[PDB]
């Protein structure tokens, strides 16, 4: 019964060794994942505030805009609409402001 006991103990210790090795590999990959996850957090935190202030400044600056109408808006819109469907130049003669 000594040989079978020795074989069983060897198999058990081999299984425990395999479990220890896979646990160590899991620890290593978990550490790598932690490092990768914590690598860019500072950059994200710093960049969020920059985007916040840039967006706030743009929204504030939008309120001080003055626009003047032009004489070639409807023609350009019509040309774009005609090109977007059966795309071709509108039939001649040319429109009011073709530029």
């Amino acid at each position: 019964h000594s040989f079978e006991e020795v074989v069983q103990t060897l198999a058990s210790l081999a299984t425990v060794v395999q479990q220890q090795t896979i646990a160590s590999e899991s620890l290593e990959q978990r550490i790598t994942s932690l490092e990768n996850g914590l690598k860019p957090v500072y950059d994200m935190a710093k960049t969020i505030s920059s985007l916040n202030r840039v967006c706030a400044e743009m929204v504030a600056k939008y309120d001080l805009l003055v626009m003047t109408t032009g004489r070639a808006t409807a023609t350009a819109a019509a040309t774009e609409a005609y090109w977007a469907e059966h795309g071709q130049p509108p039939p001649g003669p040319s429109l009011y402001e073709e530029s």
């Binding site: 939008y62 309120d63 805009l65 003055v66 626009m67 003047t68 109408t69 004489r71 808006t73 409807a74 023609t75 819109a77 019509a78 609409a81 005609y82 469907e85 059966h86 509108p90 039939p91 001649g92 003669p93 429109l95 009011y96």
Partner: protein, 1362 residues
Amino acid sequence: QHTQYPDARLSSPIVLDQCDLVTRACGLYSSYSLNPQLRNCKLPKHIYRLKYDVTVTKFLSDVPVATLPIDFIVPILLKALSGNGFCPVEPRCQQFLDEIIKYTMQDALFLKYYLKNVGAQEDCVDDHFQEKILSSIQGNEFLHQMFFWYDLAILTRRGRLNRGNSRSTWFVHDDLIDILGYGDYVFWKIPISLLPLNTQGIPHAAMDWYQTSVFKEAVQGHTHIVSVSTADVLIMCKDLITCRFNTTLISKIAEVEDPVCSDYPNFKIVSMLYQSGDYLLSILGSDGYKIIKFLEPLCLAKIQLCSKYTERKGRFLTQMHLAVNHTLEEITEIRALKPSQAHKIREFHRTLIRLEMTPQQLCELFSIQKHWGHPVLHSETAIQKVKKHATVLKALRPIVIFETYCVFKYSIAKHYFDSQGSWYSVTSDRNLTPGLNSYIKRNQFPPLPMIKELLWEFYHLDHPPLFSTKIISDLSIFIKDRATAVERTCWDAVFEPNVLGYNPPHKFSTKRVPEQFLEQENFSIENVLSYAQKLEYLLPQYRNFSFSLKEKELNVGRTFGKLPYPTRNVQTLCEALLADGLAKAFPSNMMVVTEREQKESLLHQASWHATVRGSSFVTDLEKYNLAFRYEFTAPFIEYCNRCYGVKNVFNWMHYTIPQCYMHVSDYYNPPHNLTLENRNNPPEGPSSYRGHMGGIEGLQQKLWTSISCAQISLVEIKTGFKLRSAVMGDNQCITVLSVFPLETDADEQEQSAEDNAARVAASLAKVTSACGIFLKPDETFVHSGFIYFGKKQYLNGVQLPQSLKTATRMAPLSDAIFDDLQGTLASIGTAFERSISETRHIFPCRITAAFHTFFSVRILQYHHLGFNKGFDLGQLTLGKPLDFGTISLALAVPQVLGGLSFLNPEKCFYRNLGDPVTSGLFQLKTYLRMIEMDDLFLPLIAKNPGNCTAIDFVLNPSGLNVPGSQDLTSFLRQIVRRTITLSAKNKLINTLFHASADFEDEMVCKWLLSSTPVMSRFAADIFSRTPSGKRLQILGYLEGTRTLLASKIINNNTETPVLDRLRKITLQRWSLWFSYLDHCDNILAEALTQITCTVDLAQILREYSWAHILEGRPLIGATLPCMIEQFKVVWLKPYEQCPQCSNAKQPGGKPFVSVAVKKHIVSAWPNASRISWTIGDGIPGQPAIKPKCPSAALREAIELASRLTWVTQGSSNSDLLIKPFLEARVNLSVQEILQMTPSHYSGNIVHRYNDQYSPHSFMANRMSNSATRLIVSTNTLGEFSDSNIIFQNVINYAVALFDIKFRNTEATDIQYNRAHLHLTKCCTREVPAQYLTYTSTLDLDLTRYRENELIYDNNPLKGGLN
């Protein structure tokens, strides 16, 4: 014979460009047109033979070559033209004067008698009534001039015919004045000694044509001078004379009724105003209308100055005074007025300023603006005015546009959520809108005060389409008998070849909508949508957009645009889609009077997050059209496109207008420098331009109104106030609610409300200016209790009268298709009813109507235009001359019996009559009882039945089968159908109008009347939703005589010419009336004896008629009693017992309606003397499933199924009855629509068809001021004697009776406190619950209608279910 029919009333702008040609043919000189091309062009074939005319040469033999403009001489002609000369017309209009006066007196008597029969009359009557009326009528200032001008109008109207060769002239010599008429041209020869002079010695009329030395040597030893004009000026002068006569007569008559104080201004001040305006015009030419135009704002300011006058009520008058002073200063510096003339010319506005009248009189005077004429228009000046404001560069603020777009989207979403249940399933990445997600999940909607920081979140919302493009239920909008523009190829073919100087290479086929509609092979709604989607309106041949000067106004000129036919169809489809789709989210509220609103409801509405005071201000909506740019309106247009399935439909105008060449389509002057070589690319000058960036008046009005409402909503959101807006005509009124605490008295409340309104106006001005549209703070006024809007003007809740605007428009002649007498009399009756709707007097309007009725009858009998000269309608139709008695008798029997009577006294109480036949019978009986000829009732009402058809019975459910009560509509419908038979290659109309259409219509109407008992209103209601109704609504499009006598398709069918048939039918109709004793039978006369009950008379009269339709089946739901004959009044004293309720009410008692008078006065302007001047307190079935965006056909099918199911409840054949009516409408099946059909549960269907379905709104025919001081109790009736009593009409009758009884007595003099309306026991019955039973089925094949035009609804379930 002829294809011409000149108009009887002014309907065109006054343009005198062509007269420059006429003076060139006679050798004179004139400068009307600003186009030099007319100075050296080729004269037409006519107006060139004038040099061969001996009469014209004799006329122009002792006059200078120089002429004068006609706009400087119109007041002179008006003042110095009376009828004393020789006129070619044989029967002069002055001869048959006395008879007319006689008739008028008779009418007055009748009305009094009628009132005395009702129980209203008056108190302390005067014996001198008829003499006063006689003196007022005979002593009028504008009497003989009216007859003379009508003679002149008859002459010039007859002369305008004979378009062929060898034309003739007419000559009139009236003492000082000489008139020569020739084919739409008039020459006036006048003395020189009666023209105002300059400081240089020349008339003011020659200032701008001649130099000082040229005119003096031109006149030399001459005393008479000649002016040349068209035939429109004569019609205008005739209209002015008629209006002045009517105004003076009404003002004079109104003094007799109320000697102390009357609501009409006067008959002495108005004459002074007329003279002052005439002098101002004669001095200043056509430029005096700039001063005449200030009559209305000055009247408004003077009305506004009749209140507490805290601070701001004097600003508007000051601004108007400054403006009129500046205008008078600017237009008189060049002219060399004498100091006397300079002092005299200001009398008009000096009298206007210093007026002292009550607000009612000023409101009445507000309506005499157009009593001086209309200006002379020029194409050049109008084009220059339009060019400005349409090419200027604007500056916009993007943030305001963003906020407006967000408010637009928010309003649409709120409207969708309010109905339809819940939100519209917002797609597209909901996490982009934090704040709205909670509301969407909880299925709620933000109230309002918290919508200020999540406004931007409405930009990101996306959803499927919410509205349908198959919701057109009226095809008649596509054929309306109008005129359109021509193709770009033949754009210059609408001008005269002689004036142009060349023959255009290309010609058009037709220019009218109905003619082009029938020749379009591929017409369909889907085809129009595809045409719009492919941007087919940008094709080179679809860019014309002509202009047209508008009708009578007081401006330098306003224009409207005309588009080619397919673009016109696109515009009409867009307008219909916007009307039935959007624009219900932006409604017009109205009824914003604070003083006439419930205090609790007003306080509840005024809450945003306690007495409530509201103010208001009004802004003008006129120039918004030209101030719209694509940069501002693009997002709204894109959102409108997205709300439907369309792609490029709603921006048709902004894409093609800038590519068009703009000009005015005037016949006699083309654009400057137009030659054959530069025809494809013409130059732009004084009357043309290329780049148009703004909008056009009328087009896309609904979208612009929606944008304005969105702006107002944004302003309301910005400042924490409550705003209510209304839009009508060319203006919008905005009222602001302020809400105040309790202990704040009532003195500073008005000032605080005015301050709030002023700050709201400032904010709105800032917003609109940031949007590119500029308001005028000078023209914007703020008040606290005065609101004028459309047809309603209120002063602190008190309604002001305005009845002259309708009463002064009465005239013997009007356009009624071939000068039909029935049409003219109906128009006069409608005008009388509308006029008596306002004000409080009664007699003047009825006297005017009675005066004009006999005049129209005589003038049509003797001087009809459809026959040859010297023709007498009343001679051959009878064989004996038409006596006064025959006309008087034939003007008394009502029209429902076929008797040419439209002035029913019952209309003085309520607008809508329950039963025309019963009321007519009662009126005829009363009239015959008044005179001593009571033994004519049976022969008058017996008559003979006509040969009608079930179609006519369905069309008129409450009429009689007599030939004299029929209109001309059937004749025109038959003509149009006959024309369609040999024409209309539309390829989709032909499917609808197949060979067996009439057979199907007759069978459907016969089946609908085969129930037991027979009901007419139900059949008429059902018949309108069948394809027969669609065919009938397509058929009736003819509107005028000109299109009847001049159309190409109508008159190319050969057969009998239309004129002969019209003459035959006119002769037959004239024979039908005025004859008597020839169209009667003794069979019904003996059967209607010893009845003495108007309800029974009406019932047997209805049953005897339609006998060939109703074999022996009973008729129900058609007879109602006359409310005058159903109640009696007692006018109880303050302390007494009613004899009827006490002496004759012992066994069971008598039901009655009680009327009592309140004591609180609230407000009164200017005093509490009159009841009309004061106001008081006191206000006057669910389905299982619901479809999403249902089509028109689905809605019609659902309604028809509901009606059929509800009417037939005692039967068990609904499944077999509704089946044949749904095969031609929808693709669904029976027992599936019934799920959508609401489970109707009512009783006694006649009551639901009488008031619940509301065929008419009933309303009232009196002012609403007196209805707030009376309390009416109707619960005293007990068991309500269900019944034949209409409660709304009972309330209206009581209120109107009380108003009429006390209208000339002061409040303290009234000695009556309460009134009892006791009902008789003869005309009131019991109606039991009855139902219709059908013993057959329609058994007709209606499955052939497989066209998508307006009939079939393939795939109804497209938008989903609720």
